[PDB]
Amino acid sequence: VSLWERFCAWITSTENRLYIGWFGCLMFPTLLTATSCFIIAFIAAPPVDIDGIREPVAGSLLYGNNIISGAVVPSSNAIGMHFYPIWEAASIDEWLYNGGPYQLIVLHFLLGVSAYMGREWELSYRLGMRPWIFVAFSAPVAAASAVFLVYPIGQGSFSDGMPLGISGTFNFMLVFQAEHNILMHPFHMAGVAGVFGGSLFSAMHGSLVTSSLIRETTENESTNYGYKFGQEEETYNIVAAHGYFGRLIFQYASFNNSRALHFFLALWPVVGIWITSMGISTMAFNLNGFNFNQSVVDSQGRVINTWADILNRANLGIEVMHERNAHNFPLDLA
Amino acid sequence: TEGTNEWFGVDDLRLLAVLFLGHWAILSLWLGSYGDSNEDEDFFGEIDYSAR
Amino acid sequence: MLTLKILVYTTVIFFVSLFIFGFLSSDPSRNPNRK
Amino acid sequence: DLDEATRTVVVDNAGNTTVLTPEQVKRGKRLFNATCGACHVGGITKTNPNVGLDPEALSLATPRRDNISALVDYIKNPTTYDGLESIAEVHPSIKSADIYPRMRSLTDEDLYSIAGHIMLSPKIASEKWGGGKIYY
Amino acid sequence: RGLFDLVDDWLKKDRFVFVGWSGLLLFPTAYLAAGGWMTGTTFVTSWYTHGLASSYLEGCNFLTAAVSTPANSVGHSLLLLWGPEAQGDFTRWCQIGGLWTFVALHGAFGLIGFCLRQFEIARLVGIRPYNAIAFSGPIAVFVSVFLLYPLGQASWFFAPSFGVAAIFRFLLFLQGFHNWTLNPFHMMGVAGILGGALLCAIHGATVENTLFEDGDAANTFRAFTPTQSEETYSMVTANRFWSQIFGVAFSNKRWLHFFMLFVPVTGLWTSSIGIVGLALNLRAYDFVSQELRAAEDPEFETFYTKNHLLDEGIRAWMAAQDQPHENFVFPEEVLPRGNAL
Amino acid sequence: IAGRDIESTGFAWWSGNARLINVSGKLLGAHVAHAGLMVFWAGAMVLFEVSHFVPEKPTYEQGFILIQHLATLGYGIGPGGEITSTVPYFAVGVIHLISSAILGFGGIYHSLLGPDTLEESFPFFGYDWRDKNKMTTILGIHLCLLGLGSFLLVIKAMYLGGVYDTWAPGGGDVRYITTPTLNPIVIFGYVFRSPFGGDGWVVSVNNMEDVIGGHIWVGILCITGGIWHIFTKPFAWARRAFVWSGEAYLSYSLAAISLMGFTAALYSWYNNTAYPSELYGPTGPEASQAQAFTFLVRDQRLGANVSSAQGPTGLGKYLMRSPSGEIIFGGETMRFWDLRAPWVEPLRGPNGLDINKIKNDIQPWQERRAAEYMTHAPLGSLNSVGGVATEINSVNYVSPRSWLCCSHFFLAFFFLVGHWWHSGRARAAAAGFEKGINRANEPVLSMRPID
Amino acid sequence: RLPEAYVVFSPIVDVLPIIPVFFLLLAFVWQAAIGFR
Ligand code: CLA
Ligand code: CLA
Ligand code: CLA
Ligand SMILES: CCCCCCCCCCCCCCCC(=O)OC[C@H](COP(=O)(O)OC[C@@H](O)CO)OC(=O)CCCCCCCCCCCCCCC
Ligand SMILES: CC1=C(/C=C/C(C)=C/C=C/C(C)=C/C=C/C=C(C)/C=C/C=C(C)/C=C/C2=C(C)CCCC2(C)C)C(C)(C)CCC1
Ligand SMILES: CC1=C(/C=C/C(C)=C/C=C/C(C)=C/C=C/C=C(C)/C=C/C=C(C)/C=C/C2=C(C)CCCC2(C)C)C(C)(C)CCC1
Ligand SMILES: CC1=C(/C=C/C(C)=C/C=C/C(C)=C/C=C/C=C(C)/C=C/C=C(C)/C=C/C2=C(C)CCCC2(C)C)C(C)(C)CCC1
Ligand code: OEX
Ligand SMILES: [Fe+2]
């Protein structure tokens, strides 16, 4: 009867086209502002002093870029970790010079993605679902907050944060290799196993369902039209695909349970990306990966090279060349 | 002035009257239904289905 | 620049207050089980 | 393959050469990394990269520093590179060992093995010792 | 009846491990690729080929051990044990790097023999052969990297060695010298690998969260007998969920599980096309409109020109120790350093 | 066996301690046994940290994390961060070891011989999760203890010995907190700051008067709010917003313990007041400034004017100006211009680094400190070799800050996942559909057309 | 190291922090011996 109850009834209605919910009250204003500023800053945005040395790096399309090289540049080294909104900038020209829109996009992104995650919970509550799709979405939220939030914190500047682009991503990955040795760190190892394993069990499960489909169509029409939507009959012989994989490797390595099978597809990647995103986090605070340089010696004591020493000389090439003007002192403490 | 240690970033006095009239303008909406109810009615559930 | 700043704290604590007083609005009872 | 010709290092300013027993080269590495190696790792100096532990750089000091007797001289009394004034107040030493807690327990044979490690390491690794990151 | 029928009936007999006709190609060749790797990473060194240490005898752990590629002087020889290089000696065969071609060749006939295994079991069980066609994805990555990439290059030396950190340098060797991340075929491959990991994390978490009540226990894993005809999760609910969260959603289980096949496999085929184009050094190295402008205007900087200076560090610093056969003796004064690093 | 198989409960062996939700004696014995393990570790770790103590190396080079908390309390510490005694550290690790054998016996008694439910025999200790008067009493009793435990810091810092102030005039030493700060505009000044750079929400407490003065207000709140929740009952709005069940209270804690998990992991990276650099090693920001100060001293001895020394980029090579106007150090160290450290604050002014004081008054203990904090920067590896990621294997050092900021930070994300799991289940266990969708009554079928 | 009346037990103390890991493994050993029921 009241105005608030007629507003709570609408905002929590599943009869809307898109469910809004109470998290959409701060998902939609956040992500539309992260979007509408990203499209403008990617297309039309002046160059940005990223190294704090007043050498402005172009990143937008109107200043001679493309899809690959164009990128929303991170904020300045001069700012660093300080909060830099528009009203604390004394003009928009001073805001866009010093890496303004990187903080406006990222902070409205991480609020909107952490609200998109809670929104996946909310609709599962109002639909009668068991709730935990949003726990599986915690794994890219862990990884998005690792390269945009946690790594600028432990390194003390948003300038070490990830550039919102495509070539800026590979500037981020290579400089992160030289300074932290991520490939030898066992948490990037535990998530390469998460996505190689994840793409394995995806294409391994998706093939054994498509292999054992039941005849419901003719050879002229499509294979997919043998599934009517909302039917109650099972659309594939699960005993058939169990007997196949029960002979392809051996018998006891096969899940006859389809529920425990469809749980292992959700376990393996998500655990692999939780562990990986806490690799960037523990390497944000300079707890680097393994270092086996000069580890094998002869009885005389001369250093015998290994593959890690060849990997070290690739890291030394990126270390002596990243931010080639920003350094003045012999050790990259930042 | 960015790195000042001021509460909620309230630099000027005018920003307070923005905050108080934001929480209260929806609080007064909320009290139009969930306010003025019996504050002495209990349940032995995990969850209450009392009224609107 | 102190006119924009006023506009943001309106918009933030408008939607934050809809969030805060959304879950205070007997939100566990809004399920498909009963009521 | 630690031959005694390779363990034979120069010991005095005149140029006599004596050999290091195999416990000297082993304690010489453990003590150097624990005491000196925080800044003098691999022969370079972190806090002053001009003055290294190179056998070229030890020889060009105004007292010649290549000898074992010259290095243990430096530890008990560190002068500068031109040897005019003392920097015992800032370099860890025996004379100024009340400030540095790391050097309150060192014997004569312990400095004899640390200086043994500084001298015998350019003979093992010819270019890695104090060559910087180019020769890692 | 005949002699062929007795052999055909014996191989296809139900037993512990299904042998079949294809097991005569798989089980000898896969056993020797795997055992050739465990031996080569334990005992055989890389001291004469690369000038490294890549064994457990030489102090390397699991990470820094490898079965390494042979010398550049060998060229593309197959390095047969009886060949003109090894000449029957086992010990000189291992020091030249003969185990690496032993692993790669008997491994390539393991992936032939394992994909034939998936056609044979599908014909006996009587199903469609999409496992054997999705496994053709990983065949196109082994062939076009461990085989077709060193063939276009100077020798077998520029191939990935079969060891954990030896793959890791091959990742770094391919950025500095080839600019591999800029190649659109890797970009369509990352979209399939991160896209394939995405689909199993969603389909894992949506089936498990729209389950029906089939029991009174709190454990839902117990409430599934395998031979039941009732579906175990509400497809109508899961469609209604994602149609409001994400906006668009699958309404077809046959199209869904096919789409979980197409996305991971295509990322292995599109990325396999590009690595064949790097055997020929047809790399996507530069945007010339970016390069002509940065030469004429010494103020124009992008992130893209920042990656070239990172590649000069990879091309100069590691190439001295990368290729000891070529004898790069760089002075200290040609190596590109930055300011004060 | 009844109550300890899936036929009676419905929980498998792997989710086996979920059988303890609706028994109270077995659940009490479980919480006092895990409390017996928290104690037992801390006693046995400090004895492990005493038996490997060497007076030669500093306190942070030896890789300890627990005997540096007691040195902040002031036991066995001397002036300048020099640990003297290490007989009182032995004494603390025995009391936290003997006592776990008593808390161990409560965990083995109450969970193997105690009654399954306390509500039958012991009406004071027995409870129900759905009850709301008892649960605020359990919250109230265990809040007055957290009030009293906060005053033990205050009693110890004002009366019993004192605490280690690294800002203490004359050098870092055990200092009695005479006059703590009791201003709520200052103490709650911290709690309502920005969490970003320069403000640094609650990490940025920069003297021991605000620390010890702050733990007073915590003891005031936790006792008045402890008495508040004993007497009262949850209000009308608080009964409508929560789920009053067993697992829901567990997912309330896991959200809040993750807040404390990140914050203790960010104290250890930035704060050099509660965590003195003499004990925990230099911070991330502090070792970046100690490098630029060392080469400032180095090239000042070569007769170089360091103020007018034009850098290679055109900025200051040594001294430049911050974006708020202050004289700072230049390089990549310009990001850490908020670094307030007891060896650089002698060189401050109103404006910043006083150029007259740099040209004339640099004391050799600052040179011995900046050279110590350059070589022991918090940059390590998992095999515990120091330096940069491309450093050779000779040193054995990873800073104890980097172990605390990478492990309590590591856990504090997984306990945020524990807030997501255990509250998704508890909100759905209250509503009835945690076991799945009913086949007879599906809620989606009784809705509108889909669009 | 430990005080002089306690230098004898320096091997036993080195094992002691490991012992809380052994309680995590003690649960699974107990679940194996009960037959996971
Ligand atoms: C923090 C660790 C911890 C603790 C304290 C508990 C505690 C408990 N669990 Mg449990 N559990 C744990 C971890 C833990 N669990 C883990 C990790 C798993 C997964 C494998 C399980 C799986 C599990 C299942 C499946 C079940 C329990 C059950 C129980 C309860 C009763 C056990 C019982 O009566 O059987 C008798 C127990 C034994 C015979 C074990 C004897 C081992 C002794 C006590 C070891 C003592 C060693 C110690 C050093 C001695 C100190 C003595 C002192 C004087 C110094 C008890 C409260 C049961 C339950 O729910 O009860 C209703 C049950 O069904 N647990
Ligand atoms: C939080 C922990 C906790 C809780 C709630 C309980 C609760 C209970 N225990 Mg139990 N117990 C515990 C820990 C705990 N115990 C520990 C650690 C041990 C090992 C020593 C035991 C050993 C034990 C035995 C052997 C028995 C009980 C019994 C009981 C029941 C009746 C107790 C009674 O007579 O009350 C009134 C008791 C008192 C007023 C005496 C209190 C004296 C203590 C020393 C005061 C505590 C001082 C202070 C608050 C603690 C400060 C240290 C702190 C910072 C850690 C009751 C349910 C009895 C039972 O269930 O009957 C079958 C029983 O026989 N307990
Ligand atoms: C371990 C810590 C702890 C825990 C878990 C709880 C748990 C609880 N407290 Mg409690 N409390 C504690 C410590 C704790 N208390 C302490 C130390 C104090 C003393 C300051 C209080 C004072 C207190 C009060 C006064 C009330 C509760 C209430 C509650 C219930 C939940 C409400 C809530 O979280 O809203 C979280 C809400 C916020 C963080 C913001 C609320 C903003 C308020 C409502 C604006 C109105 C102004 C109001 C007069 C306060 C002025 C301060 C400022 C906001 C203007 C719950 C039983 C409520 C209840 O049901 O009472 C029984 C209640 O009214 N607590
Ligand atoms: C604020 C949040 C609100 C939600 C935001 C909305 C954004 C949603 C994006 C719409 C996807 C549209 C693609 C049409 C696709 C289409 O319409 O498919 C429709 C298809 C429905 O299939 P049915 O089961 O109806 O098909 C049965 C048979 O008829 C098969 O033909 O749905 C899906 O399979 C889509 C699932 C994968 C979704 C693919 C999305 C890929 C992400 C987008 C990549 C492009 C981004 C480029 C940016 C430069
Ligand atoms: C080369 C060659 C040869 C040979 C072959 C063969 C016969 C081989 C085999 C071999 C083999 C076949 C090997 C094997 C090996 C194995 C190993 C050595 C293993 C190990 C293991 C491990 C170490 C693992 C670990 C673990 C465990 C135990 C448990 C837990 C988990 C883990 C994983 C950790 C010939 C004569 C033809 C001649 C030519 C050449
Ligand atoms: C219930 C249960 C459980 C649990 C258990 C527990 C958790 C327990 C705890 C336990 C405990 C927690 C224990 C503790 C103990 C301790 C002790 C027993 C101690 C003693 C001490 C001593 C003996 C010492 C000595 C010494 C001295 C005096 C001096 C110096 C030297 C030394 C250190 C040697 C489980 C899981 C199985 C499961 C089932 C059920
Ligand atoms: C010791 C010390 C101190 C002090 C401290 C303080 C004084 C504290 C405070 C604290 C506080 C004062 C805190 C607060 C917190 C709060 C929170 C964190 C809240 C939360 C809330 C919630 C969680 C809510 C939720 C919700 C919503 C939103 C809606 C509806 C439903 C519910 C209700 C659930 C200082 C700083 C001086 C310094 C250092 C030392
Ligand atoms: O900003 Mn971006 O990258 Ca991280 O390391 Mn230091 O800071 Mn700068 O150099 Mn390297
Ligand atoms: Fe599936």
Of the candidates F326, F376, F371, the one whose C-alpha atom is nearest the C-alpha of residue F352 is: F326
Residue located via tokens 């896209």: E195
Determine if ligand 4 sits within 6 Å of the CB of residue E248: yes
Residue located via tokens 């065969």: E93
What are the percentages of helix, strand and coil residues in chain E, rounded to 5? 55, 0, 40
CA distance D93 to D71: 12
F269-288 burial by CB neighbour count: b if 16+ within 10 A, else e? bbbbbbbbbbbbbbbbbbbb
In terms of DSSP bridges, do strands A296-297 and A164-165 run parallel, antiparallel, or are they unpaired?
unpaired
β-sheet bridge partners, residue A57: A48
End-to-end CA separation in angstroms for chain A: 60
Strand (E) or helix (H) holding B47: none
CA distances for F81 relative to A103, D36, F106, F207, angstroms = 40, 21, 39, 17
CA distance A137 to A113: 10
Q: Do C25 and B34 make contact, defined as CB atoms within 8 angstroms?
A: yes
Structure determined via: cryo-EM
Q: Do B37 and F243 make contact, defined as CB atoms within 8 angstroms?
A: no
Phi, psi of A74 (to 5 degrees): -65, 170
End-to-end CA separation in angstroms for chain C: 48
Of the candidates F252, F284, F274, F300, the one whose C-alpha atom is nearest the C-alpha of residue F419 is: F252
Residue at A149: amino acid letter: L
In terms of DSSP bridges, do strands D17-19 and E66-67 run parallel, antiparallel, or are they unpaired?
unpaired
D104 part of contact set with chain F, CB < 8 Å: yes
Residue in D2, D125, D128 nearest the CB of A299: D2
Determine if ligand 2 sits within 6 Å of the CB of residue F114: yes
Structure tokens that stand for C22 in this block: 């959304």
Q: Which residues line ligand 5 (CB under 6 A)?
A: E 32, 34-36, 38-39
Of the candidates F438, F271, F257, F418, the one whose C-alpha atom is nearest the C-alpha of residue F341 is: F271
Would you call E111 helix, strand, or coil by DSSP? helix
Contact of B36 with C24, CB cutoff 8 Å: no
CA distances for E96 relative to E56, E70, E170, angstroms = 18, 6, 20
C23 part of contact set with chain B, CB < 8 Å: no
Cβ neighbourhood burial of E314 (10 Å; 0-12, 13-18, 19+)? buried
Residues written for chain C: 35
β-sheet bridge partners, residue D79: D86
DSSP result, E210-279: SBB---SSS-SSSS--TT--B-SB-HHHHHHHHHHHTS-----HHHHHHHHHHHHHHHHHHHHHHHHTTT
CA distance F418 to F421: 5
End-to-end CA separation in angstroms for chain G: 47
Residue at F374: amino acid letter: M
Residue at A100: amino acid letter: G
Of the candidates A85, A159, A142, the one whose C-alpha atom is nearest the C-alpha of residue A276 is: A142
DSSP conformational letter for F328: E
Structure tokens that stand for D88 in this block: 């015992």
Alpha carbon E37 to its chain centroid, in Å, reads 16
Residues written for chain G: 37
Contact of F6 with F16, CB cutoff 8 Å: no
The CA angle A221-A226-A231, to the nearest 5 degrees, is 155
Would you call A72 helix, strand, or coil by DSSP? strand
Residue at D85: amino acid letter: E
CA distances for F15 relative to A269, D38, E221, F19, angstroms = 22, 49, 12, 8
Residue at E125: amino acid letter: V
Q: Torsion angle of alpha carbons B44, B46, B49, B52, nearest 10°?
A: 110
CA distance E65 to A314: 18
Strands, E, within E17-164: which ranges? 66-67, 162-163
Contact of E300 with E293, CB cutoff 8 Å: yes
The alpha carbon of residue D43 is apart from the nearest alpha carbon of chain A, in Å, by 15
Count of C-beta atoms within a 10 Å radius of residue E339: 15
Chain D CB contacts of F371 below 8 Å? 39, 47, 90
Contact of F116 with F80, CB cutoff 8 Å: no
Handedness of CA F130, F136, F141, F142 (dihedral sign): positive
Among protein residues, the one whose CA lies closest to atom 4 of ligand 8? A334
Of the candidates C4, B7, B9, B18, the one whose C-alpha atom is nearest the C-alpha of residue A86 is: C4
Cβ neighbourhood burial of E149 (10 Å; 0-12, 13-18, 19+)? buried
User: Residues of F numbered 242-281 whose beta carbons fall under 8 angstroms of chain A's beta carbons: which are they?
Assistant: 266, 269
Contacts of A147 (CB under 8 A, 6+ apart): A161, A162, A172, A280
- Does the annotation list D117 as a binding residue? no
Q: Torsion angle of alpha carbons E48, E54, E57, E60, nearest 10°?
A: 140
The alpha carbon of residue F79 is apart from the nearest alpha carbon of chain B, in Å, by 32
Contact of D35 with F395, CB cutoff 8 Å: no
The alpha carbon of residue E135 is apart from the nearest alpha carbon of chain A, in Å, by 9
Contact of E181 with E175, CB cutoff 8 Å: yes
CA distance B28 to E216: 45
Contacts of A122 (CB under 8 A, 6+ apart): A12, A19, A21, A22, A23
Chain C interface test: which of A3, A6, A20, A25 (most C C-beta within 10 Å): A25
Q: What atom in ligand 3 is closest to the CA of residue F146?
A: 1
CA–centroid distance, F35 to ligand 2, in Å, is: 14
Contact of F391 with A332, CB cutoff 8 Å: no
The alpha carbon of residue F9 is apart from the nearest alpha carbon of chain E, in Å, by 7
Among protein residues, the one whose CA lies closest to atom 33 of ligand 3? F238
Q: What atom in ligand 6 is closest to the CA of residue G26?
A: 37
CA distance D49 to D71: 19
Contacts of E339 (CB under 8 A, 6+ apart): A324, A325, A326, A327, A328, F312
Of the candidates E178, E171, E186, the one whose C-alpha atom is nearest the C-alpha of residue E153 is: E178
Contact of B12 with A87, CB cutoff 8 Å: no
Structure tokens that stand for F290 in this block: 């100690």
Chain B interface test: which of C17, C27, C31 (most B C-beta within 10 Å): C17
Residue located via tokens 């002509």: E292
Q: Do B30 and C21 make contact, defined as CB atoms within 8 angstroms?
A: yes
The CA angle A145-A150-A154, to the nearest 5 degrees, is 170
Strands, E, within F79-211: which ranges? 163-165, 173-175
Chain A and chain D share a number of CB contacts under 8 A equal to 26
Residues written for chain B: 52
Alpha carbon A256 to its chain centroid, in Å, reads 33
CA distance G10 to F55: 17
Looking at all shown ligands, the one closest to residue E90's CA atom is 5
Residue in F5, F41, F51 nearest the CB of G1: F51
Would you call F100 helix, strand, or coil by DSSP? helix
Of the candidates F423, E325, F402, F410, the one whose C-alpha atom is nearest the C-alpha of residue A279 is: F410
DSSP result, D11-80: -SSS--EEE--TTHHHHHHHHIIIIITTTSGGG--SS-TTS---HHHHHTSSS---SHHHHHHHHHS-B-
Residue located via tokens 């190439």: E319
CA distance F152 to F55: 30
Looking at all shown ligands, the one closest to residue A202's CA atom is 9
Chain F CB contacts of G31 below 8 Å? 13, 16
Residue at E40: amino acid letter: G
Q: Do F431 and C26 make contact, defined as CB atoms within 8 angstroms?
A: no
Contacts of A126 (CB under 8 A, 6+ apart): A12, A14, A19, C30, C31, C32
Q: Do C22 and A90 make contact, defined as CB atoms within 8 angstroms?
A: no
- Does the annotation list D39 as a binding residue? yes
Count of C-beta atoms within a 10 Å radius of residue F362: 17
CA distance E298 to E308: 15
Count of C-beta atoms within a 10 Å radius of residue E320: 16
Structure tokens that stand for B18 in this block: 């923005």
Contact of F65 with F87, CB cutoff 8 Å: no
CA distance A88 to G33: 66
In terms of DSSP bridges, do strands F327-329 and F319-321 run parallel, antiparallel, or are they unpaired?
antiparallel
Residue at F388: amino acid letter: V
Phi, psi of A48 (to 5 degrees): -125, 130
Contact of E132 with E115, CB cutoff 8 Å: yes
Contact of E88 with E190, CB cutoff 8 Å: no
Alpha carbon F120 to its chain centroid, in Å, reads 40
Contact of A182 with A281, CB cutoff 8 Å: no
Q: Do D38 and F367 make contact, defined as CB atoms within 8 angstroms?
A: no
Contact of F25 with F115, CB cutoff 8 Å: yes
Contact of E256 with E250, CB cutoff 8 Å: yes
Phi, psi of F256 (to 5 degrees): -75, -30
CA distance A95 to A86: 6
Cβ neighbourhood burial of A231 (10 Å; 0-12, 13-18, 19+)? middle
Count of C-beta atoms within a 10 Å radius of residue A15: 11
Phi, psi of D9 (to 5 degrees): -120, 160
Residue located via tokens 């005479």: F178
Chain F CB contacts of C31 below 8 Å? 431, 433
Of the candidates F253, F250, F243, the one whose C-alpha atom is nearest the C-alpha of residue F18 is: F250
Structure tokens that stand for F279 in this block: 């004990």
Structure tokens that stand for F7 in this block: 């036929």
Strands, E, within chain A: which ranges? 48-49, 56-57, 71-72, 164-165, 296-297, 303-304
Looking at all shown ligands, the one closest to residue F187's CA atom is 7
CA distance A240 to A226: 18
Strand (E) or helix (H) holding D9: strand D8-10
DSSP result, F344-413: TGGG--SSBS-HHHHHH---HHHHHHHHHHHHT-S-B-TT---SSTT--TT-----HHHHHTTTHHHHHH
Q: Do B42 and F244 make contact, defined as CB atoms within 8 angstroms?
A: no
Contact of A311 with E169, CB cutoff 8 Å: yes
DSSP conformational letter for F63: T
Contacts of E124 (CB under 8 A, 6+ apart): E12, E20
Strand (E) or helix (H) holding F321: strand F319-321
Among protein residues, the one whose CA lies closest to atom 38 of ligand 6? G27
In terms of DSSP bridges, do strands F319-321 and F173-175 run parallel, antiparallel, or are they unpaired?
unpaired
User: Residues of A numbered 84-103 whose beta carbons fall under 8 angstroms of chain E's beta carbons: which are they?
Assistant: none
Chain A CB contacts of E230 below 8 Å? 232, 234
Of the candidates B8, B11, B51, B16, the one whose C-alpha atom is nearest the C-alpha of residue B33 is: B51
CA distance E339 to E58: 38
